[PDB]
Amino acid sequence: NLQTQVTEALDKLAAKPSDPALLAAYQSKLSEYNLYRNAQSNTVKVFKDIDAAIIQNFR
Template sequence: MAGSSTNSTAQTIANDASAIDTVNSYFTDPVIAQSDALKVALDSLKTDSSNAAALAEYQGKLAQYNITRNAQSTSIKVIKDLAMSIIGNMR
C-alpha cells in the first residue's frame, strides 16, 4: 500500500500545473515554432538587408520570441519565489 501512495504522490506532482518543469513545458512548442520563424525571417533579411518589409518581419518575429521567453522566465521565477517563501516560512 505504501508504494501505491508514493505513486499517487508522484503522479500528483508530475501533473501539478505549478511545477517548474510543467510550466517550462508549456512554452516548449511556442518557443520552437517562434525560433524557426525567426530563423526564416533572418535568412530573408540576410538576402536583402535593405528590404524594409523583411526588416519589419524580422523585428515582429523577434518581438514575439522575446515576449514568449520573458513570459517563460517570469512564470518560472514566480514559482521559484513562491517555493522559497514557503521554505522560509517552515524554518
C-alpha cells in the first residue's frame, strides 16, 4: 500500500511547492520509494536467474 501514500503526498506539495518542512518530508518519502523499487527489481531478478540456471545445467 506504499503507492497510496506516495500518491497522496505529491498533491499537497503541488498546491504548495514552497513549504520547507513538506518538501523535506516529500523527498524523504520519494527517495525511500526509489530505494524500494529497484530493491524489488533486483530481488525478483535473482529468483529468475538461479531458476534459469537449473534448466541451463540440465538441458
